[PDB]
Write a protein that binds this ligand. Sequence first.
Ligand SMILES: N[C@@H](CCC(=O)N[C@@H](CSSC[C@H](NC(=O)CC[C@H](N)C(=O)O)C(=O)NCC(=O)O)C(=O)NCC(=O)O)C(=O)O
Ligand SMILES: N[C@@H](CCC(=O)N[C@@H](CSSC[C@H](NC(=O)CC[C@H](N)C(=O)O)C(=O)NCC(=O)O)C(=O)NCC(=O)O)C(=O)O
Ligand SMILES: CCCCCCCCCCCC[N+](C)(C)[O-]
Ligand SMILES: CCCCCCCCCCCC[N+](C)(C)[O-]
Ligand SMILES: CCCCCCCCCCCC[N+](C)(C)[O-]
Ligand SMILES: CCCCCCCCCCCC[N+](C)(C)[O-]
Ligand SMILES: CCCCCCCCCCCC[N+](C)(C)[O-]
Lengths: 600, 598
Amino acid sequence: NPKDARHDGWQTLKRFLPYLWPADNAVLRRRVVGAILMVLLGKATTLALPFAYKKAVDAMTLGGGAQPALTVALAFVLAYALGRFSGVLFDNLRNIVFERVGQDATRHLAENVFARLHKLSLRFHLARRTGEVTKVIERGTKSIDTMLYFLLFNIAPTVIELTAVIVIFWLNFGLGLVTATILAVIAYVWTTRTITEWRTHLREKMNRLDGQALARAVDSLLNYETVKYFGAESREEARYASAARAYADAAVKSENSLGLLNIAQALIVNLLMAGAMAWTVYGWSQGKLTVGDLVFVNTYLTQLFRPLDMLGMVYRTIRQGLIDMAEMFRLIDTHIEVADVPNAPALVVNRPSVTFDNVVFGYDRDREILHGLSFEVAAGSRVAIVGPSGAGKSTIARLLFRFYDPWEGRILIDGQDIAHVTQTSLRAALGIVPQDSVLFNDTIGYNIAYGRDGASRAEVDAAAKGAAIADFIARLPQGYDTEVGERGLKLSGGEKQRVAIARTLVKNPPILLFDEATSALDTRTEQDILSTMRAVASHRTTISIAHRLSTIADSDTILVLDQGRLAEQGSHLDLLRRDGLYAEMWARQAAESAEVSEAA
Amino acid sequence: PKDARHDGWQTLKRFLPYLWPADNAVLRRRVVGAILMVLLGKATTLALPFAYKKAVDAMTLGGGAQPALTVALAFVLAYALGRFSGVLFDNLRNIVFERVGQDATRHLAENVFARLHKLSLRFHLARRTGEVTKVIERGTKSIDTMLYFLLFNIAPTVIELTAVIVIFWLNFGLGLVTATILAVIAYVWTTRTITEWRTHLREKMNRLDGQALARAVDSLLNYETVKYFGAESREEARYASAARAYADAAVKSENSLGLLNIAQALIVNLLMAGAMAWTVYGWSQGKLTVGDLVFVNTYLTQLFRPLDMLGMVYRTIRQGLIDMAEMFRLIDTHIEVADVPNAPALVVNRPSVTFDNVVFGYDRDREILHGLSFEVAAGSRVAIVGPSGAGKSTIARLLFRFYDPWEGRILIDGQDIAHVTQTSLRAALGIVPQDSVLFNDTIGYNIAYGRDGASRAEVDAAAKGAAIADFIARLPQGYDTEVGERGLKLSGGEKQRVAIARTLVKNPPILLFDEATSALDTRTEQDILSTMRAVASHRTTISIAHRLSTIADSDTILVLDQGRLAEQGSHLDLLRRDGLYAEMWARQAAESAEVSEA
Ligand SMILES: N[C@@H](CCC(=O)N[C@@H](CSSC[C@H](NC(=O)CC[C@H](N)C(=O)O)C(=O)NCC(=O)O)C(=O)NCC(=O)O)C(=O)O
Ligand SMILES: N[C@@H](CCC(=O)N[C@@H](CSSC[C@H](NC(=O)CC[C@H](N)C(=O)O)C(=O)NCC(=O)O)C(=O)NCC(=O)O)C(=O)O
Ligand SMILES: CCCCCCCCCCCC[N+](C)(C)[O-]
Ligand SMILES: CCCCCCCCCCCC[N+](C)(C)[O-]
Ligand SMILES: CCCCCCCCCCCC[N+](C)(C)[O-]
Ligand SMILES: CCCCCCCCCCCC[N+](C)(C)[O-]
Ligand SMILES: CCCCCCCCCCCC[N+](C)(C)[O-]
C-alpha cells in the first residue's frame, strides 16, 4: 500500500503519478511519451551546440587541418546558432505537447475532491464565506500548477543536464572540473534553500501586514457614511497610514532579502566560473586543451546554471504546491460516515408509510437527543410533529433523509429500513420545504427545475403555478431567466419558500416534509403560504414539524415529542381534551399571541 | 500639465514627483545612489566581454606558450569577477531603491484614499468586501510590477542598447549595427503583437476559471439542498463541463506562450547567425581577432537576456499604467459638496433648524422635494412623517449636507449650512440611522468613535446612557470585545444601542433619529423608545419614522406630502383635523388589527 508510507513530498507525487499516466486514455499517454522525447532532443541539442562553438574557435586558431578555415568556422557558427534556436523549439514543443496532460491531471484531481466533498458528512457544515474559500482555492490552484510545471520542466531537465555535464566533463577534463562543479551545485542548492526558508518567513509577515492595511481601507470605504457622520476622515487616514507604513517596512525587508539571495548565488556561480576557466586555460598552456575548450567550458557552465537562477522561487513553489496537494489527498482519504451498504437495493415505495422504530440518536456521542423514539405515520395521512425545547423534533428530517444514521433503532419507509437502501432512491422518495430555503446563483427557472433532473418548461410552469409564484415571475422583466440569490435579485422570505414548494412540486415525491417551513415568515405571509402548502400536501404522506401549534391544528394526527420520546398522540381536539403537554403548549402560545396582540 | 495626450507618458510624468519627493532628501539621496548603481552595473557588464575577448586574443597571438598564460589567466579572472560585480551592482541598486518605491506607492495610495473621502456620497459606496479587496490587491500588484519593470528592466536595457550600438559602431560593421537594430525592432514588434493576442486569451481563461470555481463553491455552500434533491452526480457533471471549458482555454493560452518564445528565439538566433558569420568573415581577412567572435556573441546574449521577458514586461507595464491612470482620474474627480472660500465655523448657540423652500432630488430628472419649508424650535422633540412620496428620507442627508439643495436653503441657528465649514456643521449633528454599522474593531473603539479623543470614562457614560453598559459588563473582555466580523455578532437592539452610545459620546445639540427602529422587532422597538426619549433630553430632536405610533408623543409632528409640508401639529390636533395624518393613523391601526386578527 502506497498509503502505508511516510507522509512526505515523495508520497504525494507518487499519488499524483497515476493522474499523469492515466491508463484510461492512451491519447494522453502518447502525449507524455512525446513530451519526454522533446526533453531528450532538447538536451541533446543544448549539449551539442557548445561543441559546435568550440570547433569554430578551434578552426580559427588551429587552421592546420581545418581548411578552408573560413568555410569550417562559418559552418560551425551556423550549427551553433541553429542549435540555440532548436533547443528553444524543442523545449516549447515539450510544453505545448504536455499542457493538455497537465490540465487533465489537475482537473481530475479537483473532480475527485469535489465528489468526495459531496459524499462527506453534514457535520463539517460546509457553509462558510464564498470569498474566503474562493481566494484559498484560487491560491491553491495556482500553487499546484506552478509546482507541477517547475517539477516537470525545470527540476527534471536540470537533473538530466547535470548528470550529462558530469559525464562529459569526466570523459574530457579534470576530473577536478567534475568535483569543482558538483561542489558548486551542492553549495548553490544548500545556500538557496537556507536563504529561501528565511525569505518565505519574511514574505508571510509582509502578506499578513498587507491584508491588515487593505482591510482598514476597505472597512473605511464601505463605511463612508459613518465616517462622514462623525467627521472621522483624518482619523481614518491616519489609521490607514500607520498600517500602510508597517506594510512598507515589511515589504522593504522582503524585497531586500531577494538581493541577498541573488548575490549569494552569483558568488558561488562566479567562483566556479573563475576556477574552471583558469583551469582550462592552464590546460591549454600545457598543450592538453584547445582554445575552443575555454568557450566550451564557459558555455556548459552558464547553460547549467541558467535554470538554477530561479531555484529560490522554484523551491518555494514546489514546496507550497506539495503541501496544497497533500491537503487534497487528505480530503479524498477522509472516510464517509454515511454510505450505501454493498449491493444496496433501491428503496421501493408502493405504500408510502414512515416508521421510527426505537430510535436513539444524537449529533455527538456525548449528547443523546432521541432516547428511543417510536412512531408510525400512515400512508397518505397528514401528520404533525411538535414538542417543547428538548424534544428532538429538529432531528427528524435529517434522520429521514439519512444525513445521519441512528445510534440505535431504525427508520423504515414502506417497511424497508432506510439504512439498507441506496441513498439516491431514498431521497427520491422525499420532499422537503425547510425553514431557510437557499437559492443557487442562477435563474429562478433553474432553481425551480432543480427539483428534477430533466424538468421541462411545462413542469416548471405547472409547479410555479401550484406554488402560486407564477404571477410574481410573469411580472419580472426577465421572467424565468431572472438571476436570483447572491449577485442577483433579492427574494422575500415568502417568495423563496414558494420557489422551494415549486421545487418539490417538480420532484413530485410521495412523502413530503415541512420542516419549520413557515417559522421564518411574518404572520400574514405565513397564513398566505399555509393554503398553498395544504394544497400541495394533497395526496401525499405529509409530515409537518412546527413550533407554532395553530399552524398544524388541522392535521389528521399530531405526535407530541417530549425528551426525545413520544409523549402524546392524537387529533388537535383529543389533545386539548387530554389536558396534557399539548394542551399546556397550546394555552401558552395562545396567551403569548394575545399579549403581543395587546400591544397595538 | 493635465492638458496633455493622456497616455502612459502623462501618467508617468505625474508619478515622478512621488519618486523625487522634494519633501524627503534621504529618498532623493537613495534615487541618486540607485542611478549610480545602474551606471556602474552597465559599465561592468559592457567591460566584462572585453576581458573575455582579450583572454582569447592572448591565447591566439601566442606564437608559443610565452607570457600568454599570465595574461589569459588575468583576463579570465577579470571576466568572472566582472560577472559577479554586475550582479552585485544590480542587486544593490534594487536594495537602495526599494524604500523609495514603497514610499512613492504608499503616498499615491494615501492621496487616493483622502480624495475618496472628500468625494460625493452618490458614488454608490456599497459593494462586496471581497470584490473591492480583490480589485485593490490586483491593482497594487499591477502598479508595483510595472514600476519595477520600467525602472529595472526597460530603462537599463535602453542604456545598454544605446551603448552596444555605439560600441559596435566604433569597432565593427557598421552592418553589424544595422543588423542588431533591425533585430531589436523586429523583436519588440513581434513580442508586442503576439502579446496583445495572448492577453486576450488570458482574459478568456480567467473568466472561464472564475465560472468553474463559482459553480463548485455555490454547490458546496448549497450542500444541504444538493442532498435534498439527491443532486450530487448532477453538480459533478455541471462542475465538470465548466472545468473542461476552462482547461481548453488554459491549453490555448499556455500554448500561445510557446509560440511567443519560438518567435523570439527565431529572431535572436537569426541575428546571432548573421553577426557571428560576419565576424568570422572579418577575422578571415585579418580585420578582426578571434576574441571578437566571443565578444560579439557575449554582447548579443547580454543584450537580449532582459528582452527574454519582454512579453510579460509589456503586458504588465501596460496594465500598471492603466491602473495608475485610474488612480489619477479619482484624484482629479471634482468634489460636488465643498466649503465656500474662508468659510466660518458654524456656531450653535440656539439649536434651531430651518428648511427654507428646499427643492431637491438625487438626480436632476427626478425632483423629490418641491419647496419644503419648516421650522424646528430649539430643544423640541419633533417627528417627520409622510406617505410614499413625501421625501422624508432626504432630510437626514440634506441636514448633514451630503448633498446641496437645487434651490432654497437649510439653516441651523440662523446660519445657512452651505456657508459654513462642513466639519463644524457635522460636529453639531447626531444621527441614529436605520442600519447601524460596526467597524471591525472592539465595542470600545466603536463607541469611542463618536468623538476623536474620547476616554474610557466617556465611553462608559455613553454606554450607560444608551443602556448597553450591563450587556458589555457581562462580556469577558467588556469594551475590548471585538465586534463585526470576524467578531462577536450583536443583536439589532444591541447594535442600535451602540449607535446611540456613539452619538452620546459626540454629545450634539441636534439629534436625528432616521428610521432608527424600522429594522427592529416590536419588543426591541418598545425597549429602545424609552432610551431614545431619555437621550433626547436636552437636545433638539428630529425623528423620521414610518410607524406613527412610535412618534405620537412628539411635541409636534410635521406631515410631508409630495415633497412639501402638508400638515403640522400634535398627535391630537392632527387626529382632530381629520386629514392626511388621521388617514395614515387609521390605516396603520387597521393593519395592526389585521395582523393581530391572524
Ligand atoms: N519569453 C516570455 C517570458 C518567458 C517567461 O515567462 N520566463 C519565466 C518567467 S521569469 S520571472 C523569475 C525571475 N527570476 C527570479 O526571480 C530568481 C530570483 C532568485 N534568483 C531565485 O532563485 O529565486 C525574475 O523575476 N527576475 C527579475 C528580473 O530579472 O528583473 C518563466 O515563467 N519560467 C522560466 C522558464 O521555464 O524558462 C516573454 O517574452 O514574456
Ligand atoms: N506570466 C506567464 C505565465 C506563466 C508563468 O509561469 N509565469 C511566471 C511569472 S513569475 S514573475 C516574478 C515577479 N517577482 C518580482 O518582481 C520580485 C519577487 C521575486 N521574484 C520573489 O520570488 O520573491 C512577480 O511579478 N511576482 C512574484 C510573485 O508574486 O511570486 C511564473 O512562474 N508564475 C506566474 C504566472 O504563472 O503567471 C505568462 O506571461 O504567460
Ligand atoms: C549530445 C552530446 C554532445 C557531446 C559533446 C562532446 C564535447 C567534447 C569535448 C571536446 C574535448 C576537448 N579536448 C580537446 C580535450 O578533447
Ligand atoms: C478548501 C479546500 C477544498 C478545495 C476543493 C475544491 C475542488 C474544486 C475546485 C477546483 C477549481 C479548479 N479551478 C480553479 C482551476 O477552476
Ligand atoms: C486540485 C486542483 C486545484 C485544487 C485547489 C487547491 C486547494 C487549495 C489548497 C488547500 C489548503 C492550502 N493550505 C495547505 C494552505 O491550507
Ligand atoms: C474603486 C477602487 C478604488 C481603490 C483605491 C483605494 C486605495 C486604498 C489603499 C489600498 C492599498 C493596499 N496596499 C497597498 C497596502 O496593499
Ligand atoms: C503600495 C501600492 C499602493 C497603490 C494602490 C493602487 C490600487 C490600484 C487599483 C486599480 C484598479 C483600477 N481598475 C478599475 C482598472 O481596476
